[PDB]
């Protein structure tokens, strides 16, 4: 046991006698109503450790009694965690009874070794036509999701959960790092009304970890570790192809530079911590493709003060492999999903990774979508008919391409009434290889709006008139 | 490292670190009363103008201030562990704070039989029957088998009452019952 | 004024008799730990910068000696250490295993294998904190170090013993210059002329662990892992292991330099080292300077890049070439760190992020790329042809239906497209000098600009076959004489008549 | 020092909170449980937007429909005593001081009394949320609470940070605004609506405290000074003002 000597804010100091616990352990205060977990961070000498709290600190008397677990924070893990909501210490917070499982795991765990990594790049297919063609997803890589509210982001989250559990058979974890309570309640009920979570049986496809915004600054930084332990169970024990959602990554960085300033350390550049490059290192290197399975991560990125070279969105950018941006100017055009095709980049887009068939198809799409972007200004200012006859087809074809990128989702079958289509990879490359050559140009525009493959396009030209 | 016994007061400072490290070595080997009789005589043999000089005088050296003290503590009475304590205080330059370590040790050794005495501060000293009655009801309050000590102070600013402290308790029956007449105003 | 070793656990050892069963000369305890450094009490015979060993198996460097304690910089994680441990004294300055028997392994920064192939089998150990050679043993560079890239070997030539920077933004092709240098040495290491052999060392600082693993395959796929060492301290390693990574990497190259061999080392990158030295400095409460850096960042990179030198013929005649990598934030070549290293190295190579987007690859800024000392050490065959292309690439840059403008704007685009190069295709020296010959002697001035990448892949593929025995006299004699250039006139003008436009 | 309700006792915001300003209810609406930030410079009508929202709820507060009444609380943090004495008389004239409470921690009062006073108003606005009623609270203003708390930190020798604020000024404002919630029918159906006022300097919202409270709340109302003198009064910029409950808090007519 130990005793509390000093209570200053959200920093408690504990005095032990014999069993001095190492760093990154977890203590537990005796005599209080709810669990208050302290995490050891420094050995201060004369048998005294420096702990950061994880809940409210008031009501603590100098000289109480504090036990020791002898291990780090251990959470309930398993396959029966699918469809539940937990905080950073594994407790359930939806009043549906205690989670019961066989084994536990610790959140502070080392990276995989050098002889276990994958030696080759490999594309993850998710079914969407705009994602898997122009900005494809590597297996194990980190993905950055630009865009916020009012663009249609929370549908794209709920649909990538559904398609990987269909074409690949791998579940997902959602980790809310310092997220609002009002917006972390609507995502609970939006997933219920779309089937990906289920209150009646064991066909759920996600596990929710919610460390909300009104919690102490030590408890908002470990949530992205608790929500990575669960994602490591479905790779190390079963060998699935897991996904991982963090929303967002800036509230993991910013919650780090408030523990490192409550602990009395000199700040680095503009206000961050000295250790900005290892806390991003000792988290995002556990997200990798081992020999058993993989973990892929889609992360939301908020840039402060529109500065792309601020050290919080500059440390993160060295880890990403592909970025997709949700433009609001395509949402007022009618296209869903509202993914910009020109301002998305991929690192694995390469003739020696995805082959030459994927390459020269997806290269020509972004070139033709630039010529319509340059010719749309002469038409708006000067007029229409002055341009050549070779340019009138590029105006007509690029309005066929940017509507063939639309696709009806399976998560929206109740509302918009259409059928949700999941397109494999070999249909999307075959489709755009024919639109470029003028092979299906005589058909009108609305045959291409909101279809599946290229086969269902010509079956919709017959119903017009 | 090895473990060390905790004192029942646990004071802090640069003088409490030296009254604790001696209490963790003299509670071992059962010598807590031999050091106390020695420490109440090393307080006498420091405050002589031959010896109070050239210990606070900074321009001598460290080592020759040890040798002028390593034989002074060796010849008269002492060869316990406490001779290393004076040898350690002169090495660290902390020879000035030697009354601070001694005065801390007496209260740390007091609580092994002591009671943290009282304070009755009302007026002129009264008759004997009022004194023996408070000394025989406060004996019923300690419940620890220890013969309580007490001090009396004179303070005429309190009108007709008395304040009494038992350790860290501090009951109150004084002129603050006149300050409780704000209920006629604040209501 | 309260003292680090005024605690009650150390006063008790003194106040209860001066205890005999504690060493306090070769072994000590640990008083505190957690900010990196540890406060070790005892160890009264430790030297400065001497490696110690903890009870958990971690090495640590004795950085800071005090009258009370010792401050030990801990290599690796500091969770395994606890207050109250026992630390042993090795008895030697921090040194790494070094020798010929490391070519083919992947070690970490302390010299232990992490490729899973057993121990290394080394016999000699050199320190990491040695000094550079003085003014007497050095001499000017004279042997050329080929790159295999058509833009580097003809415009910014390198030589054996010359520092050269590679500076640019993220995802501009920085590492893909350093990889093609290692694969291009396949032609020399598998020959009989021992005087042209050249080894390689790669140091990966702060990178991802899954990018080094996909790199050692690409070297094994091209038979390039039999003369290459790799030191690796990736982004999950601790901060002292990234700081001491280029010192142990350079001490393995100093072995070949002093024993008559030539080496080559690529630090990748020195930007992520200086953000690791910043962390250890501010965790010791040192006064920050510009951009919260410590005051001695210039001592960090100068005492490392001064070792890369060429000894004279009385010292063996070896060399050591370095090629550090700096990453800039949005073209900022006026910041604190990319000016502390421009004022050290003997030239630059600039990689533009707005020529990498326009399709020119490798996106080498020819205007800002210079190499001072390495210009006098190149092949006279290359100097006879690339001295002309230096002129026309200048006259294309001022003009950015008129007379004397639409002539240079015609040739100046055919030479820009001539300097594109595919990935992982290192060309030989004498095959370059025929392709740069056709672009500066005025033969492809008539063709279209889009059909000139097709032209280089057709002319080289045939003259390597039907005129193979007639190309060897360029590489053997080392120059273009009056009989070779009169012969070279007929090879091109007969190929343009057969090349279908 | 109580906590917020969790995820389960909340429900989505649907009822309208009527302000009475033609530009607020048309383009940037407020539901009954939303947090909406009134941000702008000095002297641009930030107090006046939050003083007719108290006056406008008189038409429901004298009627019969019990589930449409609203109760208003106003917290003044560090203003002079004569200004509060002018604002009570404005709310006495419009007969709107029979359902309003005013919590005044003025400029002369001590440094910790300007720290408790935001947390001494939510505890009076949570008694109406706990008992099935509706409420409204206005913090005027929150940028003078982060200053009265910085003085208490640096005199207690705590490690400073950016602009000499401590490391937990985000934890100071988050656990005050998260107490505003829309409860569900199993707990009573109550609500609490929070309107904090934040004063920028030279229109720079990228400071320390103007970026903490922006990322906590839902939408902002950005009052400029240029439009105030060009004739547009109230000077609401609808180019930069948003609300992320959207159109789900407007009536079907509006
Ligand atoms: N000569 C070339 N031709 C075509 N593509 C190239 C060429 N050189 C590099 N690339 C492309 O550039 C991409 C990135 O190159 P590289 O890895 O060198 O960037 P980098 O600057 O090292 O990235 P980072 O430093 O951020 O890790 C590679 O995937 C490769 O496909
Ligand atoms: N709708 C309006 N039309 C015309 N004038 C107005 C309007 N609203 C407010 N004003 C005037 O603006 C002046 C200042 O407004 P107000 O005090 O509300 O601004 P404020 O920024 O909240 O003040 P402070 O900077 O002291 O917080 C008042 O004198 C008031 O008369
Ligand atoms: Mg690289
Ligand atoms: Mg005002």
From TrEMBL, chain A:
Subcellular location: Membrane
Keyword Cell inner membrane set for record: no
Reaction(s) the record says it catalyses: ATP + H2O + 4 H(+)(in) = ADP + phosphate + 5 H(+)(out)
Residue intervals of the AAA+ ATPase domain: 139-323
Binding site for ADP 1: 150-155, 336
Transmembrane segments: none
UniProt binding sites for Mg(2+) 2: 154, 183
Keyword Transport: yes
Residues that bind Mg(2+) 1: 154, 179, 183
GO biological process: proton motive force-driven mitochondrial ATP synthesis
GO cellular component, one term: proton-transporting ATP synthase complex
Binding site for ADP 2: 150, 152-155, 336, 415
GO molecular function: ATP binding; proton-transporting ATP synthase activity, rotational mechanism
Keyword vocabulary terms for this entry: ATP synthesis, ATP-binding, CF(1), Hydrogen ion transport, Ion transport, Membrane, Metal-binding, Nucleotide-binding, Translocase, Transport
Domain of life: Eukaryota
EC number: 7.1.2.2
Family of this protein: Belongs to the ATPase alpha/beta chains family.
Main function: Produces ATP from ADP in the presence of a proton gradient across the membrane.
Quaternary data: F-type ATPases have 2 components, CF(1) - the catalytic core - and CF(0) - the membrane proton channel. CF(1) and CF(0) have multiple subunits.
Protein's name in the database: ATP synthase subunit beta
Organism name: Sus scrofa
Lineage: Eukaryota, Metazoa, Chordata, Craniata, Vertebrata
Name of the coding gene: ATP5F1B
Boundaries of the shown chain within the full protein: 102 to 566 of 570
């Amino acid at each position: 046991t130990g005793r509390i000597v000093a209570v200053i804010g959200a920093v408690v100091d504990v005095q032990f006698d014999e069993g001095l616990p190492p760093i990154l352990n977890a203590l537990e205060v005796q005599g209080r109503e709810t669990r208050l977990v302290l995490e050891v961070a420094q050995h201060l000498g004369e048998s005294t450790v420096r702990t950061i709290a994880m809940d409210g600190t008031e009501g603590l008397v100098r000289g109480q009694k504090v036990l020791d677990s002898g291990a780090p924070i251990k959470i309930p893990v398993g396959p029966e965690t699918l469809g539940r909501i937990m905080n950073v210490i594994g407790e359930p917070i939806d009043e549906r009874g205690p989670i019961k499982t066989k084994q536990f795991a610790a959140i502070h765990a080392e990276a995989p070794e050098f002889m276990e990594m994958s030696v080759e790049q490999e594309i993850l297919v998710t079914g969407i036509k705009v994602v898997d063609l122009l900005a494809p997803y590597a297996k194990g890589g980190k993905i950055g999701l630009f865009g916020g509210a009012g663009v249609g982001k929370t549908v794209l989250i709920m649909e990538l959960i559904n398609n990987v559990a269909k074409a690949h058979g791998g579940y997902s974890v959602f980790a809310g790092v310092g997220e609002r309570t009002r917006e972390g309640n609507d995502l609970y009920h939006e997933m219920i009304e779309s089937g990906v979570i289920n209150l009646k049986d064991a066909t759920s496809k996600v596990a929710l970890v919610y460390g909300q915004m009104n919690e102490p600054p030590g408890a908002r930084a470990r949530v992205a570790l608790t929500g990575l332990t669960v994602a490591e169970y479905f790779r190390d024990q079963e060998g699935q192809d897991v996904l991982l959602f963090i929303d967002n990554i800036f509230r993991f960085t910013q919650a780090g530079s408030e523990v490192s300033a409550l602990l009395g350390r000199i700040p680095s550049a503009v206000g961050y911590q000295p250790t900005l490059a290892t806390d991003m290192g000792t988290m995002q290197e556990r997200i990798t493709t081992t020999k058993k399975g993989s973990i892929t991560s889609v992360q939301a990125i908020y840039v402060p003060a529109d500065d792309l070279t601020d050290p919080a969105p500059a440390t993160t950018f060295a880890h990403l492999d592909a970025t997709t941006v949700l433009s609001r100017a395509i949402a007022e055009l009618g296209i869903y999903p509202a993914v910009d095709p020109l301002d998305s980049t991929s690192r694995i887009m390469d003739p020696n990774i995805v082959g030459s068939e994927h390459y020269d198809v997806a290269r020509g799409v972004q070139k033709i979508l630039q010529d319509y972007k340059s010719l749309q200004d002469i038409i708006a200012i000067l007029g229409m008919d002055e341009l050549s006859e070779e340019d009138k087809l590029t105006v007509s074809r690029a309005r066929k391409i940017q509507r063939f990128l639309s696709q009806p989702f399976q998560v929206a079958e109740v509302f918009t009434g259409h059928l949700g289509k999941l397109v494999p990879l070999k249909e999307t490359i075959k489709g755009f290889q024919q639109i470029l050559a003028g092979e299906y140009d005589h058909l009108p525009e609305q045959a291409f709006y909101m279809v599946g493959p290229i086969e269902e396009a010509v079956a919709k030209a017959d119903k017009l008139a | 490292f090895a473990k060390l016994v905790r004192p029942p007061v646990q004071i802090y400072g640069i003088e409490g670190r030296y009254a604790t490290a001696l209490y963790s070595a003299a509670s071992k080997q059962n010598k807590l009363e031999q050091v106390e009789k020695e420490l109440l005589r090393v307080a006498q043999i420091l405050k002589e103008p031959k010896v109070a000089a050239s210990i606070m005088n900074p321009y001598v050296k460290r080592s020759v201030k040890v040798k002028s003290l390593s034989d002074m503590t060796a010849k008269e009475k002492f060869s316990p562990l406490t001779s290393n304590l004076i040898n350690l205080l002169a090495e660290n330059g902390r020879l000035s704070s030697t009354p601070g370590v001694i005065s801390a040790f007496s209260t740390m050794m007091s609580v092994h039989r002591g009671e943290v005495p009282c304070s009755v501060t009302t007026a002129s000293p009264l008759d004997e029957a009022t004194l023996t009655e408070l000394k025989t009801v406060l004996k019923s309050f300690l419940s620890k088998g220890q013969i309580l000590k007490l001090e009396v102070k004179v303070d005429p600013s309190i009108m007709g009452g008395m304040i009494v402290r038992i350790g860290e308790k501090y009951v109150d029956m004084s002129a603050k019952t006149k300050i409780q007449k704000l209920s006629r105003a604040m209501r | 004024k309260t003292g680090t070793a005024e605690v009650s656990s150390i006063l008790e050892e003194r106040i209860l008799g001066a205890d005999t069963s504690v060493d306090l000369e070769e072994t000590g305890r640990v008083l505190s730990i957690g900010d990196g450094i540890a406060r070790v009490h005892g160890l009264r015979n430790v030297q400065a910068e001497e490696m110690v060993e903890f009870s958990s198996g971690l090495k640590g460097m004795s950085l800071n000696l005090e009258p009370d304690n010792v401050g030990v910089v801990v290599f690796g994680n500091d969770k395994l250490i606890k207050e109250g441990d026992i630390v042993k004294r090795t008895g030697a300055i921090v040194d790494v295993p070094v020798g010929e028997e490391l070519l083919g392994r992947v070690v970490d920064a302390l010299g232990n294998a992490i490729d899973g192939k057993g121990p290394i089998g080394s016999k000699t150990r050199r320190r990491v904190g040695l000094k550079a050679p003085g003014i007497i043993p050095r001499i000017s560079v004279r042997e050329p170090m080929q790159t295999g890239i058509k833009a580097v070997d003809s415009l910014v030539p390198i030589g054996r013993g010359q520092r050269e920077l590679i500076i640019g933004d993220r995802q501009t092709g920085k590492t893909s210059i350093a990889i093609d240098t290692i694969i291009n040495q396949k032609r020399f290491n598998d020959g009989t002329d021992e005087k042209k052999k050249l080894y390689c060392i790669y140091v990966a600082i702060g990178q991802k662990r899954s990018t080094v693993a996909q790199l050692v395959k690409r070297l094994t796929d091209a038979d390039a892992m039999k003369y290459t060492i790799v030191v690796s301290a990736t982004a999950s390693d601790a901060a002292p292991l990234q700081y001491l990574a280029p010192y142990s990497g350079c001490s393995m190259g100093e072995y070949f330099r002093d024993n008559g061999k030539h080496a080559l080392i690529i630090y990748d990158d020195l930007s992520k080292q200086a953000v690791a030295y910043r962390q250890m400095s501010l965790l010791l409460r040192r006064p920050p300077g510009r951009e919260a850096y410590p005051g001695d960042v210039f001592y960090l990179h100068s005492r490392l890049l001064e070792r890369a030198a060429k000894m004279n013929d009385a010292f063996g005649g070896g060399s050591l070439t370095a090629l550090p990598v700096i990453e800039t934030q949005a073209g900022d070549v006026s910041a604190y760190i990319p000016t502390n290293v421009i004022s050290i190295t003997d030239g630059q190579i600039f990689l533009e992020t707005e020529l990498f987007y326009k399709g020119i690859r490798p996106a080498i800024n020819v205007g800002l790329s210079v190499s001072r000392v390495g210009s006098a050490a190149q092949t006279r065959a290359m100097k006879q042809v690339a001295g002309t292309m230096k002129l026309e690439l200048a006259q294309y840059r001022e003009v950015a239906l008129d007379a004397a403008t639409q002539q240079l704007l015609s040739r100046g685009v055919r030479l820009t497209e001539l300097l594109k190069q595919g990935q992982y295709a290192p060309m030989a020296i004498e095959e370059q000098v025929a392709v740069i010959y056709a672009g500066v002697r005025g033969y492809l001035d008539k063709l279209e600009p889009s059909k000139i990448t097709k032209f280089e892949n057709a002319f080289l593929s045939h003259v390597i076959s039907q005129h193979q025995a007639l190309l060897g006299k360029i590489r053997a004699d080392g120059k273009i004489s009056e009989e070779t250039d009169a012969k070279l006139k007929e090879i091109v003008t007969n190929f343009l008549a057969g090349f279908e436009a």
